[PDB]
Nucleic acid binder design. Structure first.
Ligand code: CA
Ligand code: CA
Ligand code: CA
Ligand code: CA
Ligand code: CL
Ligand code: CL
Ligand code: NA
Lengths: 350, 347
DNA sequence: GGCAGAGCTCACG
DNA sequence: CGTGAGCTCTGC
């Protein structure tokens, strides 16, 4: 029998749970607390939302099955977990009460791990820590057999949520030099985010004085979105005059043509195609790609990410290290960088 | 159990199928043709790529199960259809031979309908017309029981693909092809002087509205207010010096350039490598680490990468004055008579 | 020549 | 009310 969870009640329940978490002293009351700590403080965004939503639902309505994700799941107490998460947690709670400390995802239940009828170990999962966190979060929800236990675990979960850090790099280093920072940032792929960050902060060095507005987008935002042309779009006088495609994996001529075509369809006449350290083994005829782009009205050029950063640095006026850190921090917020990216970059400044 | 579909064979099969489709006289020879028509002309992009790929795999390799989408599917003849579609259809075929008429997707097998082990009616789908197309594409693949039947249906599917329209409007060509200009300038080395010209005019394009002063110098003379081959001024101060090498060189030439910039208080040096700057022993990272201890940010770049990066960062307005940039550079580097001639033979 | 998932905007019925 | 299509990103 499917269930309708009352969204006004779930809102009141999670407000009370947050106020309790803000005064919580003994978080070791329930024996799921280590599992809850590891999921909430982990780097997997979607399992945080799934865990909070399941516990909230069961704390609000004892009829629900906390392992159900969709209303038509073939279990008793199935419910539409996506709508509870997006309307209450995303729409009303995480911003004002949690400072985006779950990750500030707009639609976490469209992420692949949430697009299932049940939160289940049958659901395919990336190997390694993601598979471990999948089982931990299943175990917690499976342990939430009463409203009271679910509420107890919800408070512990939000207590650990409130401990999470933001997307801010604090430079403990007295001073770093730009080239060494870039070199360490792009040595690890970090889901494609580090090469995009290196490209973005390099544009900031040259755009600072010319009034450029650099818009780097979340790397998992799709080219079909109206919110972007390519990976990074550069505005002067409210108009995109240059777009950048970054590749930190191997690419072929069709990848290039796909980016050129998106720029051509939006009337952007200059494109830079940047090859990160993993864009290797590429016998690709760049002059033919550039010729093809030219007929489509796009001026296309190529560069390694490292060469692009050192050339931007050499051409720019030198600004305080404080200003470079600002570029990094603003870019990390703009692309809603992942936890592992934040931790990796923070470790560079230590 | 998984089988491997040979991608090079699959390419030959679909090229043959496309040529057969382009001359097909009778598309009604297989009783799936109406279902094939409705899938290929339908509005569900991922079923189009699933259909084509599965028919391609079975036509290529008789061991395949055309309903398998993933190599680890628990059926005989499972295979990695994602990699077949992306490396053959997307990578090499749809654009050049089908005009993007499947949809011109770059990663269709990341689309949700493809992210299952098997193509089956268990998989999530919208009610209505998508539900029907799902069942039709399953039925076609289910009927592709032999190589011969799979090929025939593939040819029919491509025939209907060719009937779709891919309404993209062909823009006009770029007004200003900078890459061509630079390629033409540096195709002849002219004793390393065309590389200096290419680098200098790119700096002019970028600095015209930034208040830079570009001072290029004769490229094969170490004459004393000049630093390296090109000095860039902002506020009467050199902030960047460029050496333009279009012949072999070693780290003594690099350390010499770094030392002169250091001695003048220049902390940024670019070393440009022309097309003829070949047979290089240099550990570039070691040269860079040494220059840092002398207080110099050193970096390396191809002439072509550097010039086109400057242009990409430039305003479009600078393009009117490019011939002025070339003419001023020719004078400043005291170009040889044969160099002025080669440059004028282009503009 | 290995295989396939975590995230995201934009929807449909 | 309920939830899929299509598209980004290399990870393991
Ligand atoms: Ca399974
Ligand atoms: Ca992108
Ligand atoms: Ca990219
Ligand atoms: Ca034109
Ligand atoms: Cl966070
Ligand atoms: Cl839907
Ligand atoms: Na020289």
């Amino acid at each position: 029998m499917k269930v309708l969870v009352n969204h006004e009640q779930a809102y009141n329940v999670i407000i009370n749970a947050i106020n309790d978490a803000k005064k919580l002293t003994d978080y070791k009351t329930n024996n799921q607390w280590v599992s809850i700590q590891n999921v909430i403080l982990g780097t997997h965004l979607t399992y945080r939302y799934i865990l909070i939503t399941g516990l909230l639902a069961k704390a609000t309505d004892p009829r629900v099955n906390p392992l159900a994700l969709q209303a038509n799941a073939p279990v008793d107490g199935a419910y539409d977990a996506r709508s509870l998460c997006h309307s209450v947690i995303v729409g009303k709670v995480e911003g004002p009460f949690l400072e985006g400390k779950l990750g500030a995802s707009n639609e976490p239940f469209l992420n692949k791990p949430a697009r299932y009828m049940l939160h289940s170990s049958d659901n395919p999962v990336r190997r390694g820590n993601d598979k471990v966190l999948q089982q931990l979060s299943i175990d917690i929800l499976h342990a939430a057999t009463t409203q009271t236990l679910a509420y107890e675990m919800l408070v512990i979960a939000l207590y650990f949520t409130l401990q999470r850090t933001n997307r801010v790099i604090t430079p403990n280093s007295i001073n770093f030099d730009f080239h060494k920072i870039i070199y360490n940032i792009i040595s690890h792929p970090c889901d494609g985010e580090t090469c995009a960050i290196a490209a973005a902060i390099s544009l900031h060095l040259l755009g600072e004085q010319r009034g450029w507005i650099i818009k780097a987008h979340p790397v998992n935002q799709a080219g079909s979105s109206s919110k972007e042309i390519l990976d990074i779009d550069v505005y002067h006088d409210d108009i995109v005059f240059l777009s950048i495609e970054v590749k930190d994996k191997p690419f072929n001529y069709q990848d290039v043509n796909h980016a050129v075509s998106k720029a051509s369809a939006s009337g952007i006449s200059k494109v830079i195609f940047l090859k990160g350290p993993r864009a290797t083994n590429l016998d690709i005829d760049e002059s033919l790609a550039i010729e093809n782009a030219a007929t489509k009205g796009v001026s296309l050029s190529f560069s390694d990410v490292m060469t692009f950063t050192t050339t931007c640095y050499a051409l720019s006026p030198l600004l305080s290290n404080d200003r470079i850190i600002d570029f990094i921090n603003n870019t990390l917020k703009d692309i809603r960088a992942k936890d592992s990216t934040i931790e990796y970059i923070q470790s560079i400044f230590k």
